Amino acid sequence: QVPVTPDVHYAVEAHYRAEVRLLQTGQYREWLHGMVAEDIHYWMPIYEQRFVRDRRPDPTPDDAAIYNDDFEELKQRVERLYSGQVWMEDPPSKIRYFVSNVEAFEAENGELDVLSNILVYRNRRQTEVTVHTLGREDKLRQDGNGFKVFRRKLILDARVTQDKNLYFFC
Template sequence: MPTDTQPKEAPAETARRVTAELQHQIEQHYYTEARMLQDGLYREWLEHLVAPDIHYWLPVYEQRFRRDKRPAPTPDDAAIYNDDYAMLKMRVERLYTGQVWMEDPPSRIRHNISNVEAYHTEIPGELRVYSNFTIQRHRRQTEHYTHTGGREDLLRQDGTTFKLARRKIDLDARVVQDKNLYFFA
């Protein structure tokens, strides 16, 4: 894994891009996911778009000098999110209790997904997908936050749809000004 100062690895030269038709299906899947999250359909997102063996990970990166060759974070290191299905379900269910004060009233959120690149893996039906995101979050009257970053996903084809099996989120900001990160990227 690259450190924050090393260039990220490009897909292997042997990685095979998906067809234009499959690329379109993947992009439509991401647009549906964005709409579900924007509309607060968290249970439906979890049930229909997330695999039971999910690893949803937002590692903590350090801003380092190029000469600092320490390894990049692993899932064993400190993370903002390092969730499996049970943890995601717990976070989702908390949102429906009305007791998450930071989300009462709920934030208005917009997800914009771009730069989607999809590749076949060695396992049939599994796809490695890279994408960028911008999340606009508005809370109450005057709170407005913008989060940008990238995602590295592992999608599994599930009939005519896809299930998210792995998501690694890389926020661009190393110091987040938002009061909380209680949203899904």
């Protein structure tokens, strides 16, 4: 695939930084409506530990996944956070994302295929801290002013999740 120009690469990183800011500040409605396309597939597959010899195909959207959502399903996930009855988020927790290795490639009709590494640090209550690392494989389309994501696949590094939940967006 053809790497994007440095100017488009700039634009994609700036998009991802804005996305991170919205999500770190609980602006989830602004993120969903402004940065996620109505035809989104938001997907976090379950990968099992298989021997190299195992010839089975990798997970598809038809198979087990932690997230496997369209727009309305993401909206429900987002809207639940605006209830004042999410006890675990009162007082609120903290999240901080470190996005690196953004590589963007030209697709058709001005769409882009984009890869990134993500490191997620989560803090809550008094001494709770959890950390996650993932890869992210996005398809983006331009939404002057900006981008919207319409395919997002999230690849977790840990087989057993060391956190009470994975209830955060990437």
